[PDB]
Write a protein that binds this ligand. Structure first.
Ligand code: HEM
Ligand SMILES: CC(C)CCC[C@@H](C)[C@H]1CC[C@H]2[C@@H]3CCC4=CC(=O)CC[C@]4(C)[C@H]3CC[C@]12C
Length: 396
């Protein structure tokens, strides 16, 4: 009944377990809510949809983070500049193009499962959920296999860096990692200019925008956006979604018995886990929006998890149900910026989860205590997830 006392920039808010109670208050009392620091947030599904649908008023050019300015990548652009970038990269992410990767991604899943299946135990986050989407996007970008862990470590350092709650040495670590990624990329530019390859790095390196070559700085940021979209999102729906399947044994069992129930289960895993907790928009004019007066130039946080637990839309959002149908979640956002990777992510989720179901059919949590979550304010999910299963033989 009492107003939440919350800093939406504090990663602890997303990790401590209180967020969904706080969102319930917000959606009932103050749909466009201001936190203890005055930062506006769209908290109801309608408020998020309406802002998404009006980019003239709710611009992306001010930067998607609450505490950082506009940067040279497509997520911080409005149309028509944004669509020009999308047209450079869309072809590699369509459903048809993604479906061409069924065998290739399936082999990565079997490799990873081969690595643990004889042991009867693993850390589902470290051994399964994190590496698979890293390998997929790394192959798309032309990362050598032996370079995947290094890029993944950098990607972790960049997004774990995101909180008002971390010390100024965690801030230098953030900037040092970015500088590392920048020098790596500027060397990739040298290489793909001289020796172009088939992959997404090379396409960005050699791409044109406004009839001049894409800026080296925009190449840094666009490739970074694709990498992190790739390697810091799906991992959390794989681990947090599988957690919920383990906690609802009857649903796990239904899937083991009937793989045709999988597509629906994935949509519920997405809704439940909502890996991307928010994205900002900047007001281009003073307005009144769902009864909150908003000032030109301030940001508003689109709260996707809050929208995804909106009772007026889902009826019973607090039950996890693989049979939820339809499942109109906005884990991937909505509108012109609607997730580029969303078919890639769904196919990663399908192919891995099917192999886990088939090959580790008595999977369980090592203990049913809460799974620890990353206290960061942008992307977050399970930090680790020890699991156990009856050992079995490798397949590849
Ligand atoms: C479960 C996995 C994922 C989730 C929950 C997720 C979520 C999101 C969300 C919320 C946005 C912003 C949408 C908006 O503001 O309306 C977005 C944008 C984006 N995503 Fe994803 N994403 C995931 C996977 C991926 C993958 C695998 C990639 C590519 C490797 C990726 C690439 C991008 C890009 C490039 C954008 C910016 C698109 C644009 O501005 O037009 N995402 N995603
Ligand atoms: C999950 C995806 C859809 C979105 C991924 C967006 C990623 C690439 C964004 C989010 C926060 C961004 C960082 C914010 C802090 C920052 C300030 C700088 O002065 C250099 C660039 C960095 C180091 C930014 C690099 C790009 C990051 C890491």
């Amino acid at each position: 009944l009492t107003r939440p006392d919350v800093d939406l920039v504090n990663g602890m808010f997303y990790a401590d377990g209180g967020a969904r109670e706080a969102y319930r208050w917000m959606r009932a009392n103050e749909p466009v809510f201001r936190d203890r620091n005055g930062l506006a947030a769209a908290t109801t599904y309608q408020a998020v949809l309406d802002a998404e649908r009006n980019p003239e008023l709710f611009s992306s050019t001010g930067g998607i983070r609450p505490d950082q300015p506009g940067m040279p990548y497509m997520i911080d652009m409005d149309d028509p500049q944004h669509l020009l970038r999308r047209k450079l990269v869309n072809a590699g992410f369509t459903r048809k193009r993604v479906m061409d990767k069924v065998d290739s991604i399936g082999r990565l899943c079997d490799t990873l499962i081969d690595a643990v299946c004889e042991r009867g135990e693993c850390d589902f986050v470290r051994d399964i959920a994190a590496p698979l989407p890293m390998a997929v996007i790394g192959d798309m970008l032309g990362v050598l296999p032996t370079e995947r862990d290094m890029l993944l470590k950098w990607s972790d350092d960049l997004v774990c860096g995101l909180s008002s709650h971390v010390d100024e040495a965690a801030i230098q670590k953030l900037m040092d990692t970015f500088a590392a990624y920048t020098e790596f990329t500027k060397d990739v530019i040298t290489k793909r200019r001289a020796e172009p390859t088939d992959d997404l790095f090379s396409v960005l390196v050699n791409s044109e925008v406004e009839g001049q070559r894409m800026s080296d700085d925009e190449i840094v940021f666009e490739t970074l956006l694709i990498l992190i979209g790739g390697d810091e999102t799906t991992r959390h729906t794989l681990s947090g979604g599988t957690e919920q399947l383990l906690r609802h044994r009857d649903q796990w069992d239904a899937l083991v018995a009937d793989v045709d129930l999988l597509p629906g289960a994935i949509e519920e895993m997405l809704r439940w886990t909502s890996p991307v907790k928010n994205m900002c928009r900047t007001l281009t004019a003073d307005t009144v929006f769902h009864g909150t007066e908003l000032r030109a130039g301030e940001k508003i946080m689109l709260m996707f998890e809050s929208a995804n637990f909106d009772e007026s839309v889902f009826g019973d959002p607090d039950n996890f149900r693989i049979d939820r149908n339809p499942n109109s979640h906005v884990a991937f956002g909505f509108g012109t910026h609607f997730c580029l990777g969303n078919q890639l992510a769904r196919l990663e989720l399908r192919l891995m989860t099917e192999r886990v179901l088939r090959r580790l059919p008595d999977l369980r949590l090592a203990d049913d205590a809460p799974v620890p979550l990353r206290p960061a304010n942008f992307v977050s999910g399970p930090e680790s997830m020890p699991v156990v299963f009856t050992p079995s033989a490798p397949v590849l």
